[PDB]
Symmetry: C3
Subunit: 191 residues, 3 copies
Amino acid sequence: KNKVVVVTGVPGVGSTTSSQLAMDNLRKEGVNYKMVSFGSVMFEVAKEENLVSDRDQMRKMDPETQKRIQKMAGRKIAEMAKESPVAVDTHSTVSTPKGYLPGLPSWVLNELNPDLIIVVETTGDEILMRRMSDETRVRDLDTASTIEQHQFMNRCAAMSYGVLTGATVKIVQNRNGLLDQAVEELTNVLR
Amino acid sequence: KNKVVVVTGVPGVGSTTSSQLAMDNLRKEGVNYKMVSFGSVMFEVAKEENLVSDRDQMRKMDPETQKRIQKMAGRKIAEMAKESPVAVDTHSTVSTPKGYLPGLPSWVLNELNPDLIIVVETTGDEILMRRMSDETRVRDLDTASTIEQHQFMNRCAAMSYGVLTGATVKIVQNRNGLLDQAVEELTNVLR
Amino acid sequence: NKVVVVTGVPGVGSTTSSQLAMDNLRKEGVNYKMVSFGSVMFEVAKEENLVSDRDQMRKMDPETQKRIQKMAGRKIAEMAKESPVAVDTHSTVSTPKGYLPGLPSWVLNELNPDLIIVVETTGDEILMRRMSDETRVRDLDTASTIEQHQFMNRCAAMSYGVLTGATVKIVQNRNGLLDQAVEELTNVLR
Ligand SMILES: Nc1ncnc2c1ncn2[C@@H]1O[C@H](COP(=O)(O)O)[C@@H](O)[C@H]1O
Ligand SMILES: Nc1ncnc2c1ncn2[C@@H]1O[C@H](COP(=O)(O)O)[C@@H](O)[C@H]1O
Protein backbone atom coordinates (compact mmCIF):
# COMPACT_ATOMS: atom_id res chain seq x y z
CA LYS A 1 0.00 0.00 0.00
CA ASN A 2 1.01 3.59 -0.70
CA LYS A 3 1.86 5.82 2.23
CA VAL A 4 -0.96 8.11 3.30
CA VAL A 5 -0.09 11.14 5.40
CA VAL A 6 -2.55 13.54 6.98
CA VAL A 7 -1.30 17.01 7.91
CA THR A 8 -3.48 19.12 10.24
CA GLY A 9 -3.44 22.46 12.00
CA VAL A 10 -5.89 25.20 12.89
CA PRO A 11 -6.14 28.10 10.40
CA GLY A 12 -3.11 30.37 10.76
CA VAL A 13 -0.79 27.84 12.40
CA GLY A 14 0.97 27.43 9.07
CA SER A 15 0.68 23.65 8.83
CA THR A 16 0.17 23.91 5.08
CA THR A 17 3.17 26.03 4.11
CA SER A 18 5.59 24.41 6.56
CA SER A 19 4.68 20.91 5.43
CA GLN A 20 4.88 21.99 1.78
CA LEU A 21 8.38 23.33 2.39
CA ALA A 22 9.31 20.04 4.02
CA MET A 23 8.05 18.05 1.06
CA ASP A 24 9.96 20.27 -1.38
CA ASN A 25 13.05 19.24 0.57
CA LEU A 26 12.29 15.51 0.46
CA ARG A 27 11.70 15.77 -3.29
CA LYS A 28 15.36 16.68 -3.73
CA GLU A 29 16.26 13.32 -2.23
CA GLY A 30 13.89 10.90 -3.94
CA VAL A 31 10.91 11.11 -1.60
CA ASN A 32 7.70 12.05 -3.39
CA TYR A 33 4.33 13.08 -2.02
CA LYS A 34 1.10 13.73 -3.87
CA MET A 35 0.09 16.85 -1.94
CA VAL A 36 -3.71 17.03 -1.78
CA SER A 37 -5.92 19.66 -0.14
CA PHE A 38 -9.00 18.01 1.34
CA GLY A 39 -10.49 21.51 1.49
CA SER A 40 -9.89 22.23 -2.18
CA VAL A 41 -11.31 18.87 -3.22
CA MET A 42 -14.57 19.56 -1.42
CA PHE A 43 -14.49 23.25 -2.37
CA GLU A 44 -14.61 22.35 -6.07
CA VAL A 45 -17.66 20.19 -5.35
CA ALA A 46 -19.34 22.83 -3.16
CA LYS A 47 -18.70 25.61 -5.67
CA GLU A 48 -19.88 23.34 -8.48
CA GLU A 49 -23.16 23.02 -6.56
CA ASN A 50 -23.42 26.80 -6.12
CA LEU A 51 -23.34 26.43 -2.33
CA VAL A 52 -20.22 28.56 -1.78
CA SER A 53 -18.19 31.36 -3.40
CA ASP A 54 -14.99 30.82 -1.39
CA ARG A 55 -13.45 27.95 0.58
CA ASP A 56 -13.91 29.74 3.92
CA GLN A 57 -17.72 29.53 3.77
CA MET A 58 -17.97 25.75 3.76
CA ARG A 59 -17.68 25.45 7.55
CA LYS A 60 -20.71 27.74 7.92
CA MET A 61 -22.93 25.32 5.98
CA ASP A 62 -25.07 23.02 8.11
CA PRO A 63 -23.34 19.78 9.30
CA GLU A 64 -25.48 17.54 7.05
CA THR A 65 -24.18 19.33 3.94
CA GLN A 66 -20.58 19.59 5.18
CA LYS A 67 -20.53 15.86 5.92
CA ARG A 68 -21.97 14.99 2.51
CA ILE A 69 -19.36 17.08 0.67
CA GLN A 70 -16.87 15.52 3.10
CA LYS A 71 -17.92 11.96 2.25
CA MET A 72 -17.46 12.74 -1.44
CA ALA A 73 -14.09 14.44 -0.97
CA GLY A 74 -13.04 11.32 0.93
CA ARG A 75 -13.69 8.91 -1.94
CA LYS A 76 -11.87 11.29 -4.30
CA ILE A 77 -8.66 11.22 -2.25
CA ALA A 78 -9.01 7.52 -1.43
CA GLU A 79 -8.98 6.84 -5.18
CA MET A 80 -6.08 9.29 -5.46
CA ALA A 81 -4.07 7.28 -2.93
CA LYS A 82 -4.21 4.25 -5.22
CA GLU A 83 -1.65 5.79 -7.60
CA SER A 84 1.02 7.27 -5.31
CA PRO A 85 1.90 8.16 -1.70
CA VAL A 86 -0.48 10.95 -0.67
CA ALA A 87 0.03 13.84 1.74
CA VAL A 88 -3.48 15.04 2.63
CA ASP A 89 -3.51 18.62 3.93
CA THR A 90 -6.61 18.99 6.10
CA HIS A 91 -8.03 19.48 9.62
CA SER A 92 -8.31 17.22 12.65
CA THR A 93 -11.63 18.98 13.33
CA VAL A 94 -13.33 21.95 11.69
CA SER A 95 -14.75 24.76 13.79
CA THR A 96 -18.37 25.15 12.72
CA PRO A 97 -21.30 27.07 14.24
CA LYS A 98 -22.55 23.73 15.51
CA GLY A 99 -19.18 22.90 17.04
CA TYR A 100 -16.11 20.87 16.09
CA LEU A 101 -16.76 18.69 13.06
CA PRO A 102 -14.41 15.72 13.01
CA GLY A 103 -12.40 16.08 9.80
CA LEU A 104 -11.87 12.34 9.41
CA PRO A 105 -15.05 10.69 10.69
CA SER A 106 -15.19 6.89 10.98
CA TRP A 107 -15.97 6.22 7.31
CA VAL A 108 -13.49 8.74 5.86
CA LEU A 109 -10.75 7.51 8.20
CA ASN A 110 -11.20 4.01 6.79
CA GLU A 111 -11.12 5.19 3.15
CA LEU A 112 -7.85 7.09 3.60
CA ASN A 113 -6.45 4.71 6.22
CA PRO A 114 -3.51 7.02 7.13
CA ASP A 115 -0.16 5.81 8.46
CA LEU A 116 0.75 9.17 9.89
CA ILE A 117 -1.24 12.06 11.37
CA ILE A 118 0.69 15.30 11.84
CA VAL A 119 -0.67 18.00 14.13
CA VAL A 120 1.04 21.37 13.76
CA GLU A 121 0.50 23.73 16.70
CA THR A 122 1.77 26.91 18.27
CA THR A 123 0.32 29.22 20.91
CA GLY A 124 -3.03 30.89 20.57
CA ASP A 125 -1.37 34.29 20.94
CA GLU A 126 0.73 33.71 17.83
CA ILE A 127 -2.17 32.20 15.90
CA LEU A 128 -4.45 35.17 16.65
CA MET A 129 -1.77 37.67 15.71
CA ARG A 130 -1.06 35.82 12.46
CA ARG A 131 -4.76 35.72 11.55
CA MET A 132 -4.92 39.43 12.36
CA SER A 133 -2.58 40.44 9.53
CA ASP A 134 -3.77 37.83 7.04
CA GLU A 135 -6.03 39.53 4.48
CA THR A 136 -5.93 36.60 2.05
CA ARG A 137 -8.56 34.67 4.00
CA VAL A 138 -11.62 35.06 6.21
CA ARG A 139 -10.59 34.04 9.73
CA ASP A 140 -12.76 33.81 12.87
CA LEU A 141 -10.61 36.19 14.98
CA ASP A 142 -11.42 34.37 18.24
CA THR A 143 -9.40 34.61 21.42
CA ALA A 144 -6.14 32.82 22.19
CA SER A 145 -8.20 30.64 24.53
CA THR A 146 -10.69 29.61 21.89
CA ILE A 147 -7.82 28.75 19.58
CA GLU A 148 -6.25 26.68 22.36
CA GLN A 149 -9.59 24.94 22.82
CA HIS A 150 -9.66 24.06 19.14
CA GLN A 151 -6.11 22.69 19.39
CA PHE A 152 -7.21 20.71 22.44
CA MET A 153 -10.03 18.97 20.54
CA ASN A 154 -7.74 18.47 17.52
CA ARG A 155 -5.39 16.45 19.70
CA CYS A 156 -8.28 14.37 21.03
CA ALA A 157 -9.62 13.66 17.55
CA ALA A 158 -6.15 13.03 16.09
CA MET A 159 -5.31 10.53 18.82
CA SER A 160 -8.64 8.80 18.14
CA TYR A 161 -7.73 8.39 14.47
CA GLY A 162 -4.47 6.85 15.62
CA VAL A 163 -6.18 4.37 17.94
CA LEU A 164 -8.62 3.35 15.21
CA THR A 165 -6.17 2.98 12.31
CA GLY A 166 -2.98 2.39 14.29
CA ALA A 167 -1.51 5.50 12.68
CA THR A 168 1.06 7.45 14.66
CA VAL A 169 0.25 11.00 15.73
CA LYS A 170 3.06 13.57 15.49
CA ILE A 171 2.79 16.96 17.21
CA VAL A 172 5.07 19.63 15.78
CA GLN A 173 5.47 23.18 17.05
CA ASN A 174 5.69 25.85 14.35
CA ARG A 175 6.51 28.97 16.40
CA ASN A 176 7.27 32.49 15.16
CA GLY A 177 10.91 32.93 14.23
CA LEU A 178 11.31 29.16 14.25
CA LEU A 179 9.96 27.96 10.90
CA ASP A 180 13.30 26.31 10.09
CA GLN A 181 13.06 24.11 13.17
CA ALA A 182 9.50 23.21 12.19
CA VAL A 183 10.49 22.40 8.62
CA GLU A 184 13.38 20.19 9.79
CA GLU A 185 11.12 18.31 12.19
CA LEU A 186 8.43 17.86 9.54
CA THR A 187 10.98 16.65 6.97
CA ASN A 188 12.32 13.96 9.32
CA VAL A 189 8.90 12.56 10.24
CA LEU A 190 7.74 12.62 6.61
CA ARG A 191 10.95 11.07 5.22
CA LYS B 1 -34.66 11.20 10.34
CA ASN B 2 -35.18 13.23 13.54
CA LYS B 3 -32.32 15.41 14.82
CA VAL B 4 -30.81 13.69 17.85
CA VAL B 5 -28.85 15.76 20.34
CA VAL B 6 -26.79 14.71 23.34
CA VAL B 7 -26.41 17.31 26.12
CA THR B 8 -23.63 16.64 28.62
CA GLY B 9 -21.91 18.29 31.55
CA VAL B 10 -20.53 17.37 34.95
CA PRO B 11 -22.88 17.50 37.94
CA GLY B 12 -23.36 21.11 38.98
CA VAL B 13 -22.34 22.71 35.70
CA GLY B 14 -26.03 23.18 35.01
CA SER B 15 -26.10 21.56 31.58
CA THR B 16 -29.71 20.45 32.09
CA THR B 17 -30.87 23.85 33.43
CA SER B 18 -29.37 25.97 30.64
CA SER B 19 -30.19 23.78 27.65
CA GLN B 20 -33.78 23.43 28.86
CA LEU B 21 -34.16 27.21 28.89
CA ALA B 22 -32.76 27.22 25.37
CA MET B 23 -35.29 24.62 24.28
CA ASP B 24 -38.09 26.67 25.85
CA ASN B 25 -36.86 29.61 23.73
CA LEU B 26 -36.94 27.50 20.56
CA ARG B 27 -40.47 26.28 21.24
CA LYS B 28 -41.82 29.80 20.73
CA GLU B 29 -40.43 29.66 17.18
CA GLY B 30 -41.45 26.23 15.94
CA VAL B 31 -38.60 23.95 16.98
CA ASN B 32 -39.97 21.63 19.65
CA TYR B 33 -37.42 19.29 21.25
CA LYS B 34 -38.48 16.34 23.40
CA MET B 35 -36.28 16.59 26.48
CA VAL B 36 -35.47 13.07 27.61
CA SER B 37 -33.22 12.08 30.50
CA PHE B 38 -31.01 9.07 29.95
CA GLY B 39 -30.60 9.31 33.73
CA SER B 40 -34.31 8.60 34.06
CA VAL B 41 -34.70 5.91 31.40
CA MET B 42 -31.73 4.52 33.33
CA PHE B 43 -33.13 4.67 36.88
CA GLU B 44 -36.55 3.10 36.38
CA VAL B 45 -34.57 -0.15 36.27
CA ALA B 46 -32.20 0.22 39.23
CA LYS B 47 -35.02 1.46 41.47
CA GLU B 48 -37.09 -1.54 40.34
CA GLU B 49 -34.50 -4.25 41.05
CA ASN B 50 -33.80 -2.45 44.34
CA LEU B 51 -30.20 -2.04 43.14
CA VAL B 52 -30.36 1.74 43.48
CA SER B 53 -32.92 3.51 45.67
CA ASP B 54 -31.39 6.98 45.39
CA ARG B 55 -30.45 8.26 41.92
CA ASP B 56 -27.07 9.45 43.26
CA GLN B 57 -25.48 6.02 43.70
CA MET B 58 -26.13 4.27 40.38
CA ARG B 59 -22.55 5.05 39.37
CA LYS B 60 -21.48 2.84 42.28
CA MET B 61 -23.84 -0.17 42.33
CA ASP B 62 -21.47 -2.31 40.21
CA PRO B 63 -19.41 -1.61 37.05
CA GLU B 64 -20.87 -4.80 35.52
CA THR B 65 -24.41 -3.75 36.48
CA GLN B 66 -24.55 -0.06 35.54
CA LYS B 67 -23.06 -0.81 32.12
CA ARG B 68 -25.87 -3.34 31.71
CA ILE B 69 -28.64 -0.98 32.82
CA GLN B 70 -27.08 1.49 30.37
CA LYS B 71 -27.28 -0.62 27.19
CA MET B 72 -31.00 -1.25 27.61
CA ALA B 73 -31.58 2.33 28.74
CA GLY B 74 -30.27 3.47 25.36
CA ARG B 75 -32.24 0.90 23.39
CA LYS B 76 -35.41 2.53 24.74
CA ILE B 77 -34.30 6.06 23.83
CA ALA B 78 -33.21 4.64 20.47
CA GLU B 79 -36.96 4.46 19.86
CA MET B 80 -37.76 8.15 20.37
CA ALA B 81 -34.92 8.62 17.89
CA LYS B 82 -37.71 7.76 15.46
CA GLU B 83 -40.23 10.39 16.59
CA SER B 84 -39.26 14.09 16.45
CA PRO B 85 -36.40 16.40 17.61
CA VAL B 86 -34.87 14.67 20.64
CA ALA B 87 -32.43 16.08 23.19
CA VAL B 88 -30.77 13.45 25.35
CA ASP B 89 -29.67 14.67 28.76
CA THR B 90 -26.79 12.39 29.76
CA HIS B 91 -23.07 12.27 30.57
CA SER B 92 -19.91 12.09 28.45
CA THR B 93 -18.33 9.93 31.18
CA VAL B 94 -19.60 9.21 34.69
CA SER B 95 -17.13 9.60 37.52
CA THR B 96 -17.39 6.23 39.32
CA PRO B 97 -15.09 4.93 42.05
CA LYS B 98 -13.65 2.61 39.38
CA GLY B 99 -12.89 5.55 37.10
CA TYR B 100 -14.60 7.41 34.26
CA LEU B 101 -17.32 5.31 32.66
CA PRO B 102 -18.09 6.28 29.07
CA GLY B 103 -21.71 7.35 28.78
CA LEU B 104 -22.08 6.51 25.10
CA PRO B 105 -20.07 3.31 24.47
CA SER B 106 -19.94 1.99 20.89
CA TRP B 107 -23.21 0.11 21.24
CA VAL B 108 -25.40 2.79 22.86
CA LEU B 109 -23.81 5.34 20.52
CA ASN B 110 -24.87 3.55 17.33
CA GLU B 111 -28.44 3.40 18.64
CA LEU B 112 -28.82 7.15 19.30
CA ASN B 113 -26.51 8.07 16.43
CA PRO B 114 -26.52 11.77 17.45
CA ASP B 115 -25.94 14.72 15.12
CA LEU B 116 -24.74 17.05 17.84
CA ILE B 117 -22.99 16.51 21.16
CA ILE B 118 -23.01 19.46 23.56
CA VAL B 119 -20.52 19.76 26.40
CA VAL B 120 -21.39 22.35 29.01
CA GLU B 121 -18.49 23.56 31.14
CA THR B 122 -17.18 26.18 33.53
CA THR B 123 -14.20 26.39 35.90
CA GLY B 124 -13.71 23.91 38.71
CA ASP B 125 -14.00 26.71 41.24
CA GLU B 126 -17.47 27.66 40.05
CA ILE B 127 -18.71 24.05 39.81
CA LEU B 128 -17.31 23.21 43.27
CA MET B 129 -18.90 26.35 44.63
CA ARG B 130 -22.31 25.48 43.17
CA ARG B 131 -22.15 21.93 44.52
CA MET B 132 -21.45 23.14 48.06
CA SER B 133 -24.82 24.90 48.21
CA ASP B 134 -26.80 21.93 46.93
CA GLU B 135 -28.43 19.43 49.28
CA THR B 136 -31.11 17.88 47.06
CA ARG B 137 -28.12 16.01 45.59
CA VAL B 138 -24.84 14.69 47.00
CA ARG B 139 -21.53 14.38 45.14
CA ASP B 140 -19.17 16.66 47.07
CA LEU B 141 -15.73 15.31 48.02
CA ASP B 142 -14.09 16.53 44.82
CA THR B 143 -11.80 19.48 44.25
CA ALA B 144 -11.60 22.17 41.56
CA SER B 145 -8.87 20.03 40.00
CA THR B 146 -10.64 16.66 40.11
CA ILE B 147 -13.55 18.45 38.41
CA GLU B 148 -11.19 19.79 35.71
CA GLN B 149 -9.82 16.29 35.21
CA HIS B 150 -13.33 14.94 34.76
CA GLN B 151 -14.03 17.75 32.28
CA PHE B 152 -10.73 16.93 30.56
CA MET B 153 -11.74 13.32 30.00
CA ASN B 154 -15.29 14.41 29.05
CA ARG B 155 -13.83 16.46 26.20
CA CYS B 156 -11.83 13.43 25.02
CA ALA B 157 -14.78 11.06 25.18
CA ALA B 158 -17.12 13.55 23.53
CA MET B 159 -14.71 14.04 20.64
CA SER B 160 -14.29 10.27 20.20
CA TYR B 161 -18.07 9.99 20.03
CA GLY B 162 -17.92 12.69 17.38
CA VAL B 163 -15.30 10.90 15.32
CA LEU B 164 -17.29 7.65 15.42
CA THR B 165 -20.66 9.18 14.50
CA GLY B 166 -19.77 12.26 12.46
CA ALA B 167 -21.51 14.40 15.06
CA THR B 168 -20.14 17.86 15.78
CA VAL B 169 -18.92 18.51 19.31
CA LYS B 170 -19.94 21.87 20.75
CA ILE B 171 -18.35 23.22 23.94
CA VAL B 172 -20.39 25.85 25.78
CA GLN B 173 -19.27 27.80 28.83
CA ASN B 174 -21.99 28.29 31.45
CA ARG B 175 -20.26 30.74 33.78
CA ASN B 176 -21.46 32.27 37.04
CA GLY B 177 -23.66 35.33 36.59
CA LEU B 178 -23.84 34.64 32.88
CA LEU B 179 -26.57 32.05 32.41
CA ASP B 180 -28.11 34.32 29.79
CA GLN B 181 -24.95 34.00 27.69
CA ALA B 182 -24.99 30.21 27.81
CA VAL B 183 -28.73 30.09 27.02
CA GLU B 184 -28.21 32.29 23.99
CA GLU B 185 -25.45 30.02 22.69
CA LEU B 186 -27.37 26.81 23.40
CA THR B 187 -30.42 28.25 21.64
CA ASN B 188 -28.38 28.97 18.53
CA VAL B 189 -26.68 25.57 18.28
CA LEU B 190 -29.89 23.69 19.09
CA ARG B 191 -31.76 25.44 16.27
CA ASN C 1 -12.68 -12.40 34.90
CA LYS C 2 -11.61 -8.78 34.68
CA VAL C 3 -9.12 -7.82 31.97
CA VAL C 4 -7.15 -4.76 33.09
CA VAL C 5 -4.81 -2.51 31.11
CA VAL C 6 -2.17 -0.68 33.24
CA THR C 7 -0.39 2.27 31.57
CA GLY C 8 2.00 5.12 32.38
CA VAL C 9 4.97 6.93 30.80
CA PRO C 10 8.44 5.49 31.39
CA GLY C 11 9.58 6.48 34.87
CA VAL C 12 6.16 6.98 36.43
CA GLY C 13 6.35 3.65 38.22
CA SER C 14 3.04 2.33 36.93
CA THR C 15 4.34 -1.23 36.69
CA THR C 16 5.87 -1.39 40.18
CA SER C 17 2.92 0.41 41.79
CA SER C 18 0.49 -2.02 40.16
CA GLN C 19 2.50 -5.03 41.30
CA LEU C 20 2.57 -3.95 44.94
CA ALA C 21 -1.19 -3.52 44.70
CA MET C 22 -1.74 -6.92 43.08
CA ASP C 23 0.35 -8.62 45.75
CA ASN C 24 -1.80 -6.99 48.43
CA LEU C 25 -4.88 -8.33 46.62
CA ARG C 26 -3.32 -11.78 46.27
CA LYS C 27 -3.27 -12.01 50.08
CA GLU C 28 -7.02 -11.48 49.82
CA GLY C 29 -8.13 -14.05 47.27
CA VAL C 30 -7.92 -11.97 44.10
CA ASN C 31 -5.17 -13.30 41.83
CA TYR C 32 -4.06 -11.26 38.84
CA LYS C 33 -1.81 -12.70 36.17
CA MET C 34 0.45 -9.78 35.35
CA VAL C 35 1.81 -9.75 31.82
CA SER C 36 3.61 -7.26 29.62
CA PHE C 37 1.89 -6.77 26.27
CA GLY C 38 5.24 -6.37 24.56
CA SER C 39 6.44 -9.63 26.07
CA VAL C 40 3.32 -11.44 24.91
CA MET C 41 3.89 -10.07 21.42
CA PHE C 42 7.42 -11.42 21.39
CA GLU C 43 6.34 -14.80 22.75
CA VAL C 44 3.65 -15.33 20.11
CA ALA C 45 5.91 -13.97 17.36
CA LYS C 46 8.62 -16.37 18.46
CA GLU C 47 6.19 -19.25 18.71
CA GLU C 48 5.10 -18.81 15.10
CA ASN C 49 8.68 -18.36 13.89
CA LEU C 50 8.23 -14.76 12.75
CA VAL C 51 11.09 -13.78 14.98
CA SER C 52 14.03 -15.22 16.92
CA ASP C 53 15.35 -12.33 19.01
CA ARG C 54 13.48 -9.35 20.39
CA ASP C 55 15.84 -7.30 18.21
CA GLN C 56 13.88 -8.35 15.13
CA MET C 57 10.63 -7.18 16.70
CA ARG C 58 11.51 -3.71 15.38
CA LYS C 59 12.14 -5.01 11.85
CA MET C 60 8.57 -6.32 11.51
CA ASP C 61 6.61 -4.67 8.71
CA PRO C 62 3.16 -3.09 9.36
CA GLU C 63 1.23 -6.17 8.24
CA THR C 64 3.10 -8.66 10.44
CA GLN C 65 3.08 -6.40 13.49
CA LYS C 66 -0.70 -6.10 13.18
CA ARG C 67 -0.94 -9.89 12.98
CA ILE C 68 1.32 -10.30 16.01
CA GLN C 69 -0.78 -7.76 17.95
CA LYS C 70 -3.99 -9.71 17.26
CA MET C 71 -2.25 -12.92 18.30
CA ALA C 72 -1.15 -11.32 21.58
CA GLY C 73 -4.67 -10.10 22.22
CA ARG C 74 -6.15 -13.52 21.47
CA LYS C 75 -3.62 -15.11 23.80
CA ILE C 76 -4.37 -12.72 26.65
CA ALA C 77 -8.11 -13.26 26.09
CA GLU C 78 -7.25 -16.92 26.46
CA MET C 79 -5.56 -16.28 29.82
CA ALA C 80 -8.65 -14.32 30.92
CA LYS C 81 -10.60 -17.59 31.00
CA GLU C 82 -8.35 -18.75 33.84
CA SER C 83 -8.07 -15.62 36.00
CA PRO C 84 -8.16 -11.82 36.11
CA VAL C 85 -5.46 -10.46 33.82
CA ALA C 86 -3.41 -7.29 34.19
CA VAL C 87 -1.86 -6.23 30.91
CA ASP C 88 1.10 -3.92 31.51
CA THR C 89 1.46 -1.62 28.51
CA HIS C 90 1.76 1.90 27.14
CA SER C 91 -1.26 3.99 26.13
CA THR C 92 0.98 5.42 23.42
CA VAL C 93 4.72 5.11 22.92
CA SER C 94 6.61 8.29 22.16
CA THR C 95 8.51 7.46 18.96
CA PRO C 96 10.43 9.69 16.51
CA LYS C 97 7.43 9.52 14.14
CA GLY C 98 5.00 10.58 16.85
CA TYR C 99 2.73 8.87 19.34
CA LEU C 100 2.09 5.24 18.53
CA PRO C 101 -1.06 3.66 19.97
CA GLY C 102 -0.10 0.79 22.25
CA LEU C 103 -3.48 -0.92 21.81
CA PRO C 104 -4.97 -0.25 18.33
CA SER C 105 -8.64 -1.09 17.73
CA TRP C 106 -7.78 -4.57 16.43
CA VAL C 107 -6.12 -5.40 19.76
CA LEU C 108 -8.95 -3.77 21.75
CA ASN C 109 -11.46 -6.06 20.05
CA GLU C 110 -9.47 -9.10 21.17
CA LEU C 111 -8.76 -7.86 24.72
CA ASN C 112 -12.22 -6.50 25.61
CA PRO C 113 -10.74 -4.76 28.70
CA ASP C 114 -12.94 -3.70 31.63
CA LEU C 115 -10.55 -1.15 33.11
CA ILE C 116 -7.76 1.06 31.78
CA ILE C 117 -5.52 2.45 34.50
CA VAL C 118 -3.49 5.59 33.78
CA VAL C 119 -0.75 6.29 36.33
CA GLU C 120 0.66 9.82 36.36
CA THR C 121 2.70 12.44 38.17
CA THR C 122 4.19 15.76 37.12
CA GLY C 123 6.67 16.13 34.30
CA ASP C 124 9.17 17.49 36.83
CA GLU C 125 9.09 14.36 38.98
CA ILE C 126 9.22 12.11 35.92
CA LEU C 127 12.27 13.91 34.50
CA MET C 128 13.87 13.95 37.94
CA ARG C 129 13.44 10.17 38.27
CA ARG C 130 14.83 9.53 34.77
CA MET C 131 17.90 11.73 35.32
CA SER C 132 19.00 9.84 38.44
CA ASP C 133 18.76 6.67 36.36
CA GLU C 134 21.86 5.13 34.74
CA THR C 135 20.08 4.25 31.48
CA ARG C 136 18.21 7.45 30.56
CA VAL C 137 20.45 10.56 30.61
CA ARG C 138 20.44 11.22 26.86
CA ASP C 139 16.79 11.39 25.71
CA LEU C 140 16.33 15.17 25.44
CA ASP C 141 12.85 15.13 27.02
CA THR C 142 11.61 18.04 29.16
CA ALA C 143 8.83 18.28 31.74
CA SER C 144 6.75 19.77 28.93
CA THR C 145 7.24 16.99 26.39
CA ILE C 146 6.43 14.47 29.12
CA GLU C 147 3.26 16.39 29.99
CA GLN C 148 2.39 16.29 26.30
CA HIS C 149 2.88 12.54 26.25
CA GLN C 150 0.67 12.26 29.33
CA PHE C 151 -1.90 14.41 27.55
CA MET C 152 -1.94 12.12 24.50
CA ASN C 153 -1.94 9.08 26.78
CA ARG C 154 -5.16 10.39 28.35
CA CYS C 155 -6.85 10.82 24.98
CA ALA C 156 -5.77 7.35 23.85
CA ALA C 157 -6.93 5.93 27.15
CA MET C 158 -10.31 7.62 26.98
CA SER C 159 -10.68 6.36 23.39
CA TYR C 160 -9.91 2.83 24.60
CA GLY C 161 -12.83 3.05 27.01
CA VAL C 162 -15.17 4.57 24.46
CA LEU C 163 -14.42 1.67 22.09
CA THR C 164 -14.63 -1.04 24.75
CA GLY C 165 -16.88 0.47 27.40
CA ALA C 166 -14.11 0.08 29.98
CA THR C 167 -13.72 2.61 32.77
CA VAL C 168 -10.62 4.81 32.73
CA LYS C 169 -8.94 5.46 36.07
CA ILE C 170 -6.24 8.09 36.44
CA VAL C 171 -4.01 7.53 39.45
CA GLN C 172 -1.39 9.94 40.77
CA ASN C 173 1.86 8.29 41.81
CA ARG C 174 3.78 11.17 43.38
CA ASN C 175 7.18 11.27 45.07
CA GLY C 176 6.92 10.36 48.75
CA LEU C 177 3.30 9.35 48.20
CA LEU C 178 3.69 5.79 46.88
CA ASP C 179 1.54 4.19 49.60
CA GLN C 180 -1.40 6.34 48.57
CA ALA C 181 -1.07 5.28 44.92
CA VAL C 182 -0.78 1.65 45.98
CA GLU C 183 -3.94 1.90 48.08
CA GLU C 184 -5.85 3.49 45.21
CA LEU C 185 -4.62 0.89 42.73
CA THR C 186 -5.44 -1.83 45.27
CA ASN C 187 -9.00 -0.48 45.48
CA VAL C 188 -9.58 -0.06 41.76
CA LEU C 189 -8.16 -3.51 40.96
CA ARG C 190 -10.11 -5.22 43.76
N1 LIG D 1 -11.53 16.75 6.63
C1 LIG D 1 -12.40 17.75 6.46
N2 LIG D 1 -13.72 17.62 6.79
C2 LIG D 1 -14.62 18.61 6.65
N3 LIG D 1 -14.26 19.79 6.14
C3 LIG D 1 -12.98 20.01 5.77
C4 LIG D 1 -12.06 19.00 5.94
N4 LIG D 1 -10.83 19.35 5.54
C5 LIG D 1 -11.00 20.60 5.12
N5 LIG D 1 -12.27 21.04 5.26
C6 LIG D 1 -12.90 22.33 4.87
O1 LIG D 1 -12.18 23.11 3.89
C7 LIG D 1 -12.11 24.48 4.33
C8 LIG D 1 -10.85 25.11 3.78
O2 LIG D 1 -9.73 24.21 3.91
P1 LIG D 1 -8.31 24.76 4.44
O3 LIG D 1 -7.76 25.64 3.20
O4 LIG D 1 -7.40 23.60 4.58
O5 LIG D 1 -8.53 25.69 5.59
C9 LIG D 1 -12.15 24.38 5.86
O6 LIG D 1 -12.53 25.55 6.56
C10 LIG D 1 -13.19 23.27 6.03
O7 LIG D 1 -14.56 23.71 5.93
N1 LIG E 1 -25.02 7.60 29.50
C1 LIG E 1 -24.89 7.16 30.76
N2 LIG E 1 -24.10 6.09 31.08
C2 LIG E 1 -23.96 5.60 32.33
N3 LIG E 1 -24.62 6.18 33.35
C3 LIG E 1 -25.42 7.26 33.14
C4 LIG E 1 -25.55 7.74 31.83
N4 LIG E 1 -26.38 8.79 31.75
C5 LIG E 1 -26.77 8.96 33.03
N5 LIG E 1 -26.19 8.08 33.88
C6 LIG E 1 -26.41 7.90 35.37
O1 LIG E 1 -27.52 8.65 35.95
C7 LIG E 1 -27.07 9.29 37.18
C8 LIG E 1 -27.87 10.58 37.44
O2 LIG E 1 -28.16 11.28 36.20
P1 LIG E 1 -28.07 12.92 36.14
O3 LIG E 1 -29.39 13.37 37.00
O4 LIG E 1 -28.25 13.34 34.70
O5 LIG E 1 -26.87 13.39 36.91
C9 LIG E 1 -25.56 9.50 36.96
O6 LIG E 1 -24.80 9.59 38.17
C10 LIG E 1 -25.17 8.24 36.20
O7 LIG E 1 -24.91 7.12 37.07
